[PDB]
Symmetry: C3
Subunit: 219 residues, 3 copies
Amino acid sequence: AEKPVEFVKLGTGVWMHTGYKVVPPWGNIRTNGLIIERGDYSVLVDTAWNDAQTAEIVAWAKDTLQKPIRASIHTHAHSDKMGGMDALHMLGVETFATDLTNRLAIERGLMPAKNVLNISEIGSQIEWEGLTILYPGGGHSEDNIVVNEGVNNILFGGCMIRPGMTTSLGNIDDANLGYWSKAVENAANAFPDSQIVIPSHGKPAGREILKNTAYITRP
Amino acid sequence: AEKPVEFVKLGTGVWMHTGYKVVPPWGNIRTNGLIIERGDYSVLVDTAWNDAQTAEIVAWAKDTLQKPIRASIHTHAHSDKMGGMDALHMLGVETFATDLTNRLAIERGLMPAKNVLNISEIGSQIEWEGLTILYPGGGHSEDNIVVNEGVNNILFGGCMIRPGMTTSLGNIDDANLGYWSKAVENAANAFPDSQIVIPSHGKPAGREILKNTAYITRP
Amino acid sequence: AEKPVEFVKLGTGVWMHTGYKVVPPWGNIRTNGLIIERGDYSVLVDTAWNDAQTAEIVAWAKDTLQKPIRASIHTHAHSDKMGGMDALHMLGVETFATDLTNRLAIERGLMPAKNVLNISEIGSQIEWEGLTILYPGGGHSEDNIVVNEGVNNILFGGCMIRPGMTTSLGNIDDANLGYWSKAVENAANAFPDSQIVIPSHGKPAGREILKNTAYITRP
Ligand SMILES: C[C@H](CS)C(=O)N1CCC[C@H]1C(=O)O
Ligand SMILES: C[C@H](CS)C(=O)N1CCC[C@H]1C(=O)O
Ligand SMILES: C[C@H](CS)C(=O)N1CCC[C@H]1C(=O)O
Ligand SMILES: [Cl-]
Ligand SMILES: [Cl-]
Ligand SMILES: [Cl-]
Ligand SMILES: [Cl-]
Ligand SMILES: [Cl-]
Ligand SMILES: [Cl-]
Ligand SMILES: [Cl-]
Ligand SMILES: [Cl-]
Ligand SMILES: [Cl-]
Ligand SMILES: [Cl-]
Ligand code: NA
Ligand code: NA
Ligand code: NA
Ligand code: NA
Ligand code: NA
Ligand code: NA
Ligand SMILES: [Zn+2]
Ligand SMILES: [Zn+2]
Ligand SMILES: [Zn+2]
Ligand SMILES: [Zn+2]
Ligand SMILES: [Zn+2]
Ligand SMILES: [Zn+2]
């Protein structure tokens, strides 16, 4: 049985959303994203697994925060991050991703974002709705980006950061195994003040999961 | 003189919209689409002939149903189904069509939908806002799709289904004359429980207009 | 120091917005666009220089006119006219430009409009939200369009019309120097009743700045 959606506060105006999917043979697996408050609206980092979970997140921001989701960013073209795009579009959310993420999404039967983030070179950063978005180079995926929230100093690593003290790498079918550890180092060096690090597939932690991920994926 | 727009109830939460256009030499000709209620919003099947008629439909859902139109689907790339796209986009409606419909629309000076429905193979179906959307193969047009509403068992055949007991085929300049009768059979077999069948260019009827259309367009 | 945004009434339901940018070595330079009231909403001609200025314009229409901006048109692919596209998209404004303007925008790192205006041949006109949009041919830029408001007879010339009695042409790096004066003549002949003419980079004036622009850019 699929576990229900969860919301947890990470800092002032910053919330984690978590949805679950049963993936045989191992069963329920979480994916995490963020809701970030922006005055009288909010912005979203990643969908959950599907439209229904994602619609529940939009409703929660509207009805609990009283700060409806205006716009969203997507941290790579897999179904845990873009599985609920149709729900975002029907609910009036303005969606953003890199051109490479959009192209990969279309190829895979995912829906692309409506707007392009112009960050394609390794190390490129842009400011978006008070967040710093960084392309650290290919790692978990060639298109993975990370998102830093500088008020609370929360770094969203998404699926590029592995959970806990695992030594498993997750699904690596389209990973950049050669560059992933450098990409982690690039993110860690870009955002040195962030002591809260969020992976997609585990619990919120500290910078030890940057160090551990870089070690377990290093050549 | 162009006859005005009309709304008629077909079943619980399902409404037909009808707009008219004077087309010489024969004069006024109707086109039909649907409004389908979805909780506290509604969804739209097809525009009417133009922006003004389509804006009237959007206003009617907002002000009479108190269920504003959130999203729409378009059943092929002709001006009776996509003539009012600009009005939908300006009124905040999130529009959906197949990739082939969008490509044909652009070619013809029509505006494409914002989102792609991923149904391109003959017989492919998807669920969309509680509706079943089917691509039955080429018939009236290569891109024609049909839409089934399973609560009331209403099958929207659009222009692929001819009205009444006519033997005329309408404009066949880009019809698939070889496959059209099979496409009708495919729709009839896919939705056997639907005893209400809606053509674009005639009155609501029963399954006899599926049988008649398949006969008059058969090789 | 960058001067703040300004709003001035030009006629019934027609407002000019003006934003400033410090461009060394000459300093602050204005750019002008329009807000045009449309019943219980408004439409926008051009962004200002950036997202922040453009968001201020959207808020002004919402809170002062009580006629929120529903849609916008963009008169060529430079940053004074499309520098605030991301703000328009996040604020729910439905954006329009020609296909050529969108293609040039993407090339230049600007964000394209969501919808295409189908005017690509010299002299083509379309009606859009009660306005007449004309492509007069290449002048300041190959893609420049002009916008006429026929109730007050206000012609928005954008950057194709130079300010005042200047003899400077502005930045001409991608101008059509051969056709620009004819393009001005084309606009003047298309909208003979407009005695208010708005350039992007100077004060509102009369038809003397059409005549002066045509003279100073003539072969
Ligand atoms: C569909 C996701 C995209 S990152 C995936 O590949 N999974 C599912 C959860 C983690 C990882 C895995 O295979 O271990
Ligand atoms: C413009 C429409 C698109 S199905 C059309 O071709 N018409 C107009 C109404 C019916 C049919 C015909 O020519 O008979
Ligand atoms: C960025 C704008 C686009 S029309 C520009 O080229 N400018 C800046 C203001 C006028 C003109 C100039 O160089 O003089
Ligand atoms: Cl779902
Ligand atoms: Cl995936
Ligand atoms: Cl963990
Ligand atoms: Cl119209
Ligand atoms: Cl047509
Ligand atoms: Cl869009
Ligand atoms: Cl009939
Ligand atoms: Cl800005
Ligand atoms: Cl520019
Ligand atoms: Cl001046
Ligand atoms: Na989805
Ligand atoms: Na900080
Ligand atoms: Na239209
Ligand atoms: Na049923
Ligand atoms: Na901008
Ligand atoms: Na007039
Ligand atoms: Zn992934
Ligand atoms: Zn993942
Ligand atoms: Zn048709
Ligand atoms: Zn038709
Ligand atoms: Zn310019
Ligand atoms: Zn300019």
